[PDB]
Amino acid sequence: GTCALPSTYRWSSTGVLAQPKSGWVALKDFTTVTHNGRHLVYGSTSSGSSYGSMVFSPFTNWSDMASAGQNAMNQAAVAPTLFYFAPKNIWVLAYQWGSWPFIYRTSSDPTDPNGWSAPQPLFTGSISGSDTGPIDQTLIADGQNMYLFFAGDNGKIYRASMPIGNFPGNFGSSYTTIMSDTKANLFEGVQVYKVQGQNQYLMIVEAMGANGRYFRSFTASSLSGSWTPQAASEGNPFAGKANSGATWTNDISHGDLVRDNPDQTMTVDPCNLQFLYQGKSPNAGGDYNSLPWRPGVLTLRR
Numbered sequence: 001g002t003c004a005l006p007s008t009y010r011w012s013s014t015g016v017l018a019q020p021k022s023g024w025v026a027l028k029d030f031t032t033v034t035h036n037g038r039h040l041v042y043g044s045t046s047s048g049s050s051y052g053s054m055v056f057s058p059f060t061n062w063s064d065m066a067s068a069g070q071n072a073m074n075q076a077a078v079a080p081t082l083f084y085f086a087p088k089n090i091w092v093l094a095y096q097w098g099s100w101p102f103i104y105r106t107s108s109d110p111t112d113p114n115g116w117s118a119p120q121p122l123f124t125g126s127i128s129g130s131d132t133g134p135i136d137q138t139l140i141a142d143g144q145n146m147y148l149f150f151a152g153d154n155g156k157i158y159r160a161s162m163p164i165g166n167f168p169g170n171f172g173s174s175y176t177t178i179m180s181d182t183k184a185n186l187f188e189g190v191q192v193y194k195v196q197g198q199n200q201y202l203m204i205v206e207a208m209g210a211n212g213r214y215f216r217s218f219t220a221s222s223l224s225g226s227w228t229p230q231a232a233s234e235g236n237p238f239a240g241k242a243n244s245g246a247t248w249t250n251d252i253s254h255g256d257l258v259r260d261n262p263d264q265t266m267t268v269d270p271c272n273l274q275f276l277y278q279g280k281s282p283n284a285g286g287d288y289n290s291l292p293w294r295p296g297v298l299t300l301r302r
């Protein structure tokens with residue numbers, strides 16, 4: 001019936017799942033749902049000079065991602081979050097960079113990279129001690145409230161909230177600072193999920209380790225509650241070089257746990273946990289913006 005999250009995570013990994021289309025040096029920052037029995041994946045793109053976004057043509061097996069069409073969005077949605085918002089029967093794509101710090105668009109057909117509505121403000125606030133400003137938003141609702149979580153490349157995690165009845169809409173400028181640590185420990189790539197079958201929420205945050213990017217996990221009993229470190233060191237990570245089972249990459253970086261239910265609750269099944277992540281060749285160097293990031297999938301070994 002129900003499974004619990006392990007205290008120690010062990011994964012197996014695919015190899016590189018796809019190469020970027022001509023003109024891109026990287027595929028990045030994945031968000032994914034199952035839509036009509038197929039994997040639906042949005043991501044950031046990089047040409048090395050600037051970031052854009054794209055969607056893969058829907059595919060049934062991860063092993064077929066390599067042949068999936070890669071469809072550029074004509075208006076960039078960097079570091080996107082995709083979900084179905086059930087109370088209004090509408091799909092939401094939230095992202096960073098444009099007229100506001102965070103932005104969203106809506107659609108009745110999430111497979112179309114250019115079928116999204118006019119951009120609307122999601123968040124208009126500002127944070128201190130950050131070179132980036134607000135970065136890597138995610139959205140998650142319980143039964144009562146819609147939450148915004150984000151990072152700032154600065155060791156902090158931030159949260160905002162509104163009643164679900166007021167979403168889709170603008171969180172405005174206000175936020176709460178919920179976590180504070182070193183820049184390395186709480187860097188970016190924050191994601192939050194409901195653990196199916198448990199009275200528990202799961203937060204993962206990307207950290208900069210000695211050996212590469214990795215994820216630290218935290219749990220809470222409430223989205224407005226305190227977060228308790230779970231697998232939160234480089235030696236005992238949520239997912240990292242230590243436990244990924246990946247050979248092609250020493251980095252486990254910005255992605256999304258695989259969500260079978262596409263809705264706003266961001267529910268994951270702890271019995272069948274999988275992680276769509278970005279990784280890169282250990283030999284790749286140079287400017288961050290030119291790094292050859294690629295998609296991979298981790299599968300939890302039970």
Ligand SMILES: O[C@@H]1[C@@H](O)[C@H](O[C@@H]2CO[C@@H](O[C@@H]3CO[C@@H](O)[C@H](O)[C@H]3O)[C@H](O)[C@H]2O)OC[C@H]1O
Nearest residue numbers: 050051131132133135153187188208287288289
């Ligand atoms: O163009 C800007 C982007 O580059 C920026 O993205 C962040 C840039 O810094 C990255 O972190 C660095 C990785 O390499 C390490 O050696 C450095 O210490 C880190 O700072 C981070 O991963 C990116 O998200 O955002 C703002 C854009 O204008």
Ligand SMILES: [Ca+2]
Nearest residue numbers: 079080136137
């Ligand atoms: Ca994200």
Ligand SMILES: [Cl-]
Nearest residue numbers: 159160161176
């Ligand atoms: Cl809040």
